[PDB]
Structures are given as C-alpha cells and as structure tokens.
Symmetry: C4
Subunit: 192 residues, 4 copies
C-alpha cells in the first residue's frame, strides 16, 4: 500500500521490511495580499524596467524575467511564471468570491529545492511577491508547504532522498513512495 | 484514497499536496416521540387547516403544505414531505419492533443549508415535528446530523465549500471528496 | 469501505452518513485442558449413558446427543457436535505440537445467541467441556470470543442488530457490515 | 485486508474472528563501518586461509566459506555470501554517495532463525562482519531488523508461528498474513 516496487536482474531475492516516515514535498509559496480580482493589475503604474527573479532547483538556478504593467495581475503573473520555465509552477487558488491567491510551487521536490522571489523596480509588487530568508508582516508572500525529503528505512537502514522515486538505494530496485507506513507497522516485501 | 480528481486543459501541471479536514454534511432532524406503529395517525382529530412549513436550502426557501388527518402518520408524513420537493428528503428508521422514527435530511449539504419545520393548527403534531432555534424537552424533533461544510487544504491554503465536489477552487480541477486524510498525512497529487 | 449497500424501489434518494461502532460476533467457547493428542479418548471408561447437551440459538434450543467412549476424543467430539446441527460449529485449533484445543462457535451471531454445554454421566469429560454461568478454575471450558450485536448509526440514529446484514432498519436498504468506521469519521452514502 | 485465506474439504463452515498482532520477520544484520567504495577491498593484505562462517536457519546450520583478498570488498562479499546458499541473502544499501552498507538477511523468518557471522584469519574484516551474542562498539556489524514470529488469534486463541503462511493451526485452512489488524478491530471470516 505505501509503495510500488519495480526490479531488474540485479535485485537480490530475499526478505525485506520497509518503513516510510516522510514523503518528499515541493515547497509552495502563496500570496497573502487581499486580491478581489485575479485580473486586476497589482503593480505600480508606468514601470518600464520591472523584473521578477526566481531562484529554484538544485543546484539553485536564477531566472530573471521582465514584466510589463499589464503582467502584474495574478493571472498574468501566473502565465509569465509558467512560461519562464524557472523551476517552479504557478496556479491561482480561488479561496472564495473576491478572494484569490497565487501559489508558486517548486517543479522539483526535496529539502534543498527551495525558492526565492525578488521583484526589481516595483516595491508595491515586491510587497506581494518577494520571498527570501526573512519575513516581516502578515501580507507578504508566505511558505504554505515546506520543502522536504523522502525518509524511509529498508531492512532497518534509514535512507533520505529528494524524490519519491528511489532508484539508487538498493541495486536492481526502485521504490516509488505513495504514503507513509503506519507508526509501528513496517511493510513486508519479498523479492523472488 | 481521500479524493478523486478530474482536470481540463486549464489545469497547471505541477506538484500538489492535499489535506481533507471535514466533509460537507446534510443536516438531519429525527423525530424522538415514541411511535410503535408507522401507520398510526399522530395528529389531532378533525383539523381542516393543518399545514407543515419547511424552510430549507441556501438561500432559504419556505414550502407550506397542507396535511389531512390521514396524512399525520409517519408513513404519510414521509410521503407528503418527499412529494413536496421542499429541499429535504424523508425516510423512516425502524429502530426496533414497535419503535419508529422519521428522519428529515437536507437535500443539499453545507453549514448554511439548515432546516426549520413548523406545524400550523395542530399542537399535538407540532410537539413531534416542530424544529427551530430552541428546543425544550426530550421528545421534540432533534438534530441528529449537523450541517457542515467541506474543509480542505490545497498546497497549504485552506478552502471551505458547501459541497464535496470542489470545482471552483483550482482552475481546471475538480476535487471530489471521499474521506478525510489521516491527521499528519497530506495526500500527494501530480498533475501532468 | 465499512459496508456494502443494496437497495430496492422503496429506498429514498438522499444524503446519509453512517457510523459502524461494533460488528455482530458469534460467541466461541474453547477447551483449555492440556490435550497432546486430538485422537486420544478424554472421557471416563465404560460409560453407556453419556450425553452432551448443547443450548444455543435465539430463542435458545437444547440439543442432547449421546456419546460413546470412542467419541470422547477432540476429533470425535468435533464430528459429533457438527453432525448434531445444534446451533454451533466445532473446529480444532492446533496450538502447537502436542497442544490441541476444541473451539465451539455459535452458528448465529448476536448478544443473545449464547451457548451452554453440559455433559451427563461423565464428570471427567464434564471438567473439559461444561460451560454455564459460572467458572471455577483455569482448565475448564472458557469463552474466547464474546457474543455481540452489531451497533451502527444511520444519520445519527443508533441501531442494534444480532447480525451484520441489516435489512430491517431503513426501508428499501440493506447495509452489510464489513468493518467499523474510523473514530471521528462517519462514512457518506448517497442514494439516487 | 490483513490476510488471505485458502481452504480445502477439511475446513469447518462457521463464524471466525481473527486478530493479527505481529508478522514474522527475517533478522537482518547490516555493516556499520564507513565504506566509501563498494568495490574496495576491506580485508587485510596477503591472507591465504581467510574464511567466513555463517550460522543460520532452524535448526542452526554452519556454512564456512573461503575468501581470497579480492573477495573482501562489499560487492564480492555479497556475491560470495549469496553463492554460498548459507541460509541468508546479502544486498548492498547505497545510503548516499560514498556511503555503502552490506545487509545480510535470514532466508527464513522467525524468532529462532537468527544469524551469527565469524571471520577467521582476518581481524580487520572481522571488525566489519563479525556478529554474535555481544557487541562492543559503534562500527561493528549491527542488527537492524529483529527476528520475530507471527502472532495471531483465531476465535480468541493465540497462535505463534515462524512464518506468515499459517497452514498448521486450523484444519483445512491456510492463513497467509499480510498486515496487522487494527488495535481493537478483529477481522471477520465466514467459511461456507
Ligand atoms: Cl509526509
Ligand atoms: Cl521548469
Ligand atoms: Cl490556475
Ligand atoms: Cl534547510
Ligand atoms: Cl519550514
Ligand atoms: Cl467529516
Ligand atoms: Cl427538493
Ligand atoms: Cl422510508
Ligand atoms: Cl451557524
Ligand atoms: Cl450543531
Ligand atoms: Cl467489533
Ligand atoms: Cl445448526
Ligand atoms: Cl477442525
Ligand atoms: Cl447479556
Ligand atoms: Cl463477555
Ligand atoms: Cl509486525
Ligand atoms: Cl540458502
Ligand atoms: Cl545488491
Ligand atoms: Cl530469543
Ligand atoms: Cl532484538
Ligand atoms: Na529554467
Ligand atoms: Na422546492
Ligand atoms: Na438444531
Ligand atoms: Na545451506
């Protein structure tokens, strides 16, 4: 139940027990500013050198993208971010009528697959999107899902990995994680 | 396990984690008076202007229906209520031999999809069926299922909805809720 | 997951929530005397009027069956009990090498589907098989599974039944119980 | 869910409840010495009478196998152990880059299916592989999975077995264990 197994000729037939303690997660950052209209421009008027720099991936890569005034609505920011292929994906959460938030999620899972966002030349948009090591008030960009590694034990040996597809721990075996195992309840595996 | 997902072209490929904290519920009101025979007339004799008013739905709508003396058994009240299409459904619970109760359930789920019931011109039937903001003794109509909204988190953003089919939160995505997720155990979703 | 539903034309389309708190169980009585050989005769020698009386079912019915000396091994007692169609079934548990026990289980589930066993004219076999309202020492016949009713709630109304197939609670509906529901986790049902 | 059942003509039709409290496990011993290269020779140089003695199985059997200097890498020790058919299987865990461990697991499950390992004529390899009743420091061979019996109850009678395929407890019935049952939640079985 907690995982799928695939094997090749290198797998050793035998008795295995597996515990799954944590699944790898992609960090998510979500806007917190009150936005009643996902098509309304949120940036300052008349800026010709606005950009957004996204740092993401492992190793971290920085992508800088220009944004016209028209691209400062949630919908257009989402489109610009997705089109940039910057190691993140963007989607809009309609929390309720007149209440929209933009969620930026790492394209890759893992503890070290974190995100920073920095707006240049638009402090007003910066107050909505900027995200780095420190956070000062309630309406700034906020982490809503933590970056996390997968953590499992195979025959009692603890393994940590950046993804939920573990192909480089046991030769000939790939363990694709689906859920945690129950707390005092290792799952049994026979390879034959 | 906790939910089914359907997507269209607007869904954004990416990494999602979902927690389901509450499922939407339809309020249920159940009679508590001792009724040994589901076909026995329970109302006062000889009333020609008896009615039952049912308030239900969101926004709340009031349906007033006439009831002859012959319609004051549990079976005939059930039939009259179901035939009225008043935003509720009615069924009889046979608790045991000689012990029947009438359950009136909202046709719609949600926190704000509550029910009131008011009998006119029959205080005896009123003591069995009336339900409003206050309740005085043990054999009056009683709430047995609470009205409730669905509550879930999508990539760490909490969403509340009146139904278990959530099509207006994430563009291109419908999340059909089946059960809660386990307590420290978000469920993973990849859209591709 | 906790139950299967079947309906006919009388079922009322609507919203239901179900909790399953207990499953019906068949009482089991298991021998505790040390028996190293399931074919060894356990009764006194030379008894021509030995019998076993089994009381079981609801309403309780008494079956009296004769037992020759040769029928006082665990294997032959099992065969005699099963052949008697006395409202119980009998099977032998091989606990380990040289350690056998005879388990007598009600053919019917339910709180009031209890069993008594009384041997006549063989006190030695009586010490192994007799079971009634009181029990004095460690090697007498012992209850190992409690008689129990099914207990569930349907839209918040508690129902108790002697079996796990509940066809006489909600008209047009049979609820066949498979497991309990999780503790604060009612299961949803829509009839349509 | 917790188990599969197969029957033959000897099974007695009736009502059963089963609890599964423990699954049988194969003991696993894993190397703890720091090994950055699974192909590097770990034993002392120039030994012509090196051997490894593996004790495993029930009843315990001792297998003594010769090892050349070239066979003292993790990869070659694994190959030598698997080729010896000594009642254990061996696999390499790649914990991370530059961090490999050799896991030796019993071929058979059970409380009394334990393993000892003893190197002769190579104290350096002995410090990595030796395993017996006592353990002195942190980098010696270590137990990482405990030997364990299956423990279940059938109609309230506790049964313990060395494997998860229980064919010698209830006549005509084999119970193949998959998981534990939930804590106050016996699983129901009807044979017919
Ligand atoms: Cl997790
Ligand atoms: Cl990308
Ligand atoms: Cl979107
Ligand atoms: Cl960190
Ligand atoms: Cl964090
Ligand atoms: Cl709920
Ligand atoms: Cl309606
Ligand atoms: Cl009904
Ligand atoms: Cl309210
Ligand atoms: Cl309430
Ligand atoms: Cl139960
Ligand atoms: Cl019978
Ligand atoms: Cl048997
Ligand atoms: Cl009782
Ligand atoms: Cl009891
Ligand atoms: Cl276990
Ligand atoms: Cl072997
Ligand atoms: Cl390997
Ligand atoms: Cl021991
Ligand atoms: Cl141990
Ligand atoms: Na990129
Ligand atoms: Na209506
Ligand atoms: Na009978
Ligand atoms: Na061997």
């Amino acid at each position: 139940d907690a995982f799928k197994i695939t094997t090749n000729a290198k797998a050793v037939p035998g008795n295995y027990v597996v515990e799954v303690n944590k699944l790898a997660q992609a960090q998510t950052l979500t806007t917190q500013a009150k936005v009643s209209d996902q098509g309304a421009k949120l940036g300052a008027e008349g800026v010709t050198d606005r950009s957004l720099t996204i740092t993401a991936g492992n190793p971290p890569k920085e992508t800088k993208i220009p944004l016209s005034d028209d691209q400062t609505s949630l919908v257009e920011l989402r489109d610009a971010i997705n089109g940039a292929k910057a190691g993140v994906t963007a989607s809009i959460m309609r929390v309720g009528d007149n209440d929209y938030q933009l969620a930026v999620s790492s394209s890759t899972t893992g503890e070290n697959n974190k995100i920073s966002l920095q707006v240049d030349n638009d402090d007003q948009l910066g107050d909505i999107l900027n995200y780095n090591a420190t956070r000062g008030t309630g309406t700034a960009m906020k982490q809503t899902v933590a970056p996390q590694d997968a953590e499992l034990t195979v025959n009692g040996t603890a393994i940590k990995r950046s993804t939920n597809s573990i192909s480089d721990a046991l030769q000939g075996v790939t363990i694709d994680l689906k859920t945690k195992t129950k707390t005092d309840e290792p799952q049994h595996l026979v390879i034959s």
